[PDB]
C-alpha cells in the first residue's frame, strides 16, 4: 500500500445511495461515500455532521468517509 | 507456336522437370495442352531416371510442334536406351 491523506470536514447535503457532498478544512468540495465498516455497524450520517475523509493523489475529486464524530 | 519445353517442379536444390506441350507465349509454369512425362537429374540409380510418351511427341511434331535442345537430347538418350 501507499500512504493516503486524511482530513476533517462537514457534510453539506446527502445524495442517493449513501453518497454525499462534503466541505473540507481547506475549503474544497469533494464527493464522498461510506466505508463498509459503517455499513456493518449501522452508523448513520446526515447533514451537519463532522466527519473524516481520506483522499488519494490519483483522484482528489473523490474521497471516502471513514469516521463519524459528535 | 506450340512447343515441348521443361517446367521446373520440386524444391530448392531438388529440381523435377515436367515435359510439357504448351504455347511459347505462356509462362514457364503457365497454361498448357498436355503433360507427357518427366525427368529428374537427381534421382538415385535404384529409381527410374526419366519417362516420356514417345507416341504423343511424334503426333505433335507431325502436327507442327518444335523441340528444345534439352528435350531433344532426352529423346536421343531414351531412343539409345530403347
Amino acid at each position: 500500500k501507499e500512504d493516503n491523506i486524511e482530513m476533517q470536514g462537514t457534510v453539506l447535503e446527502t445524495l442517493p445511495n449513501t453518497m454525499f457532498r462534503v466541505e473540507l478544512e481547506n475549503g474544497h468540495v469533494v464527493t464522498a461515500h461510506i466505508s463498509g465498516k459503517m455499513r456493518k455497524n449501522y452508523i448513520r450520517i446526515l447533514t451537519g455532521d463532522k466527519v473524516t475523509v481520506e483522499l488519494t493523489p490519483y483522484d482528489l475529486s473523490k474521497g471516502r468517509i471513514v469516521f463519524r464524530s459528535r | 507456336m506450340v512447343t515441348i519445353r521443361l517446367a521446373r517442379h520440386g524444391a530448392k536444390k531438388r529440381p523435377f522437370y515436367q515435359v510439357v506441350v504448351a504455347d511459347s507465349r505462356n509462362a514457364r509454369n503457365g497454361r498448357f495442352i498436355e503433360r507427357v512425362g518427366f525427368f529428374n537429374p537427381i534421382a538415385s540409380e535404384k529409381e527410374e531416371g526419366t519417362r516420356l510418351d514417345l507416341d504423343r511427341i511424334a503426333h505433335w511434331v507431325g502436327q507442327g510442334a518444335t523441340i528444345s535442345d534439352r528435350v531433344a537430347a532426352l529423346i536421343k538418350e531414351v531412343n539409345k536406351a530403347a
Binding site: I5, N26, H28, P57, L60 | -
Partner: protein, 488 residues
C-alpha cells in the same frame, strides 16, 4: 566419500544485493554468523544493501568462489570487437570560426572558398553550420562555421571543443560582441589554443591599437610577450592578410600536427543531421580517425544502420570517407541525436540489441523523472494563482534548430508568463502535429519546413492555426507578442 570441505560453491552476484537474499545465495553454515559478519566489518543492519564491489569483498571474506556480473557488459563486448590500428600517420587539423556577424560568418571563408554563391541565401545569418575540407598551400585544412546568435550557444558548444584550433573575427568598433564573449570561454576552458584576426578592416574607422592593448583586458595573454592572442589583420572585402591567416594556420598546424590512425574502424562525430524525402535520415559526420566504407555497420547513440551511400558537400557520391574529412551519409534508423559519438561496429545482430537496450533505460529514466515530478507536485498544485500559459508545437528543419528554438522559448518564460512547448520534432508538419495542436490550445509553427496534404486536410476542417516563419528573430518577436497579449 564425505570429506570435511567448507562451503566453497560458486556464487553469482549482481550489482546491488542485500542481507536477506545473501543469506541463502551463499548458503554459509553460520546462518546468523553470516549476518554478524557484515555487522562486524562495517556499519550494517538487517535490511542493509551492499554494492557489487562490496559484495565481492564479502565473498572474499567468506572465501567461496565469487562471480561478478554487471549490466554494462553489453557495451564492453561491442567495444572489444572494434578493430584497432597501431599505425599513426599525420592527420589534417580541424579548425572552427566563431564570427557572430554576417561578415564574420561568411566573408573570411567566402574569400578562401571558391565563391560567394553560398552567401546568396536569405536570412543574413548562419542558420546552420557548414564544413569545408579545403586544400591551401599544400595544406589540407578543415574549417567549421558558427551561427553565434540567439539560443545557438549550445549549438556552438557541440563544436566548441571537438575542433583543434579556433579562429575568430574581431570588430574594432564594437570592441568584443556580447555573444562573442560568451563564446570565447568555451575554448579557453577547453585549453585548446586560440588564434584571432581583425576583419572588416576595409573601413578606415577602427581602433586596432586600442584592440591590441585591450587584448590584456579581455582576459587573455597579449602576443607582444608571445601570448595566446594573435595580432594578424585580415580584410573581408580587400582580403589582404587572409593569405597571411593561411600562413598562421599552417604554422599552428605544424605546431600541433598530431598523428592519428589511418586504417580500420572509423570513429567520428555527427555535426548536423536533417530529413529529406529521398534521403530520409541524413548524417553529416566529421571522421577524426579511420575510413568509412559502404556496408560498414554504423552506430550513433541509440540509432544504427549500414551506410547505404556516402557523399560530399557538392552532392557527389564517394567510395569512402577519408579521416579528418566530413561526409554526408545515409542508412540510419532515424534522426541521429545531436553530437553523439559515431563508431563502426563489427557484427550485425548485436547492434540492434545494443540500441534497444539503450532505448529502454532512457525511456525508463525519462518517464521516471516526469512521473516523480507529477506525483510529488499534484497535491502541491492544489493552490492556484495568476498565470499566463502559452502552448506551442514546433517543427524545424534540423536537430540543432529544434534545440535552439525550444531553448529560446523556454528561457523566455517568466514566473507569471510561461511558454510551455507541448512537443517538437524535426521534419515536416504532419497529421500527428496537426491533430496534436488541434487537440490542445496550441499552434503549429513551421520554421524552414512545410505542411503536407494529410495534415492540411485536418487543418482546413479544424481551423487550426499554422504560423510560418523563416527567421529566428521574427519568430521570437511574434511569439513574444503572443504571450504578452494574454496578460490581463
Amino acid at each position: 566419500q564425505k570429506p570435511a570441505q567448507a562451503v566453497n560453491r560458486d556464487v553469482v552476484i549482481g550489482e546491488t544485493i542485500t542481507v536477506g537474499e545473501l543469506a541463502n545465495k551463499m548458503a554459509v553454515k553460520g546462518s546468523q554468523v553470516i549476518k554478524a559478519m557484515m555487522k562486524l566489518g562495517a556499519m550494517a543492519t538487517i535490511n542493509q544493501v551492499i554494492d557489487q564491489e562490496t559484495a565481492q569483498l564479502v565473498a572474499e571474506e567468506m572465501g567461496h568462489k565469487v562471480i561478478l556480473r554487471r549490466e554494462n557488459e553489453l557495451e564492453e563486448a561491442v567495444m572489444s570487437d572494434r578493430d584497432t590500428g597501431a599505425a599513426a600517420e599525420p592527420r589534417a587539423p580541424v579548425v572552427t570560426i566563431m564570427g557572430h556577424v554576417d561578415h564574420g560568418k561568411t566573408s573570411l571563408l567566402d574569400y578562401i572558398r571558391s565563391t560567394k554563391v553560398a552567401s546568396g541565401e536569405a536570412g543574413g545569418i548562419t542558420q546552420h553550420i557548414g564544413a569545408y575540407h579545403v586544400e591551401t598551400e599544400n595544406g589540407m585544412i578543415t574549417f567549421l562555421d558558427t551561427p553565434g546568435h540567439a539560443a545557438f550557444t549550445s549549438m556552438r558548444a557541440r563544436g566548441a571543443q571537438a575542433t583543434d584550433i579556433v579562429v575568430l573575427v574581431v570588430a574594432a568598433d564594437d570592441g568584443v560582441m556580447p555573444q562573442t564573449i560568451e563564446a570565447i570561454q568555451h575554448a579557453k576552458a577547453a585549453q585548446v589554443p586560440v588564434v584571432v584576426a581583425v576583419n572588416k578592416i576595409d573601413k578606415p574607422e577602427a581602433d586596432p591599437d586600442r584592440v591590441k592593448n585591450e587584448l590584456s583586458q579581455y582576459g587573455i595573454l597579449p602576443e607582444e610577450w608571445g601570448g595566446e592572442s594573435q595580432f594578424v589583420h585580415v580584410s573581408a572585402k580587400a582580403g589582404t592578410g587572409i593569405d597571411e591567416l593561411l600562413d598562421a594556420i599552417l604554422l599552428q598546424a605544424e605546431v600541433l600536427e598530431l598523428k592519428a590512425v589511418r586504417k580500420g574502424m572509423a570513429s567520428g562525430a555527427v555535426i548536423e543531421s536533417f530529413l529529406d524525402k529521398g534521403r530520409g535520415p541524413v548524417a553529416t559526420v566529421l571522421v577524426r580517425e579511420g575510413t568509412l566504407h559502404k556496408g560498414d555497420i554504423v552506430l550513433c547513440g541509440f540509432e544504427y544502420g549500414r551506410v547505404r551511400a556516402m557523399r560530399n558537400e557538392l552532392g557527389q557520391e564517394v567510395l569512402e570517407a577519408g579521416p579528418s574529412i566530413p561526409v554526408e551519409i545515409l542508412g540510419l534508423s532515424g534522426v541521429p541525436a545531436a553530437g553523439d559519438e559515431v563508431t563502426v561496429v563489427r557484427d550485425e545482430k548485436k547492434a540492434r540489441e545494443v540500441a534497444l537496450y539503450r532505448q529502454g533505460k532512457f525511456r525508463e529514466v525519462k518517464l521516471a523523472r516526469q512521473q516523480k515530478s507529477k506525483l510529488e507536485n499534484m497535491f502541491a498544485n492544489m493552490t492556484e494563482g495568476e498565470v499566463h500559459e502559452v502552448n506551442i508545437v514546433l517543427k524545424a528543419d534540423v536537430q540543432g534548430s529544434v534545440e535552439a528554438i525550444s531553448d529560446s522559448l523556454l528561457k523566455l518564460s517568466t514566473d507569471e508568463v510561461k511558454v510551455k512547448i507541448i512537443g517538437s520534432g524535426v521534419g515536416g508538419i504532419t497529421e500527428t502535429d496537426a491533430t496534436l495542436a488541434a487537440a490542445s490550445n496550441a499552434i503549429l509553427v513551421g520554421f524552414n519546413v512545410r505542411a503536407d496534404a494529410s495534415a492540411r486536410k485536418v487543418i482546413e476542417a479544424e481551423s487550426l492555426d499554422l504560423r510560418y516563419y523563416s527567421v529566428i528573430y521574427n519568430l521570437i518577436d511574434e511569439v513574444k507578442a503572443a504571450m504578452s497579449g494574454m496578460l490581463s
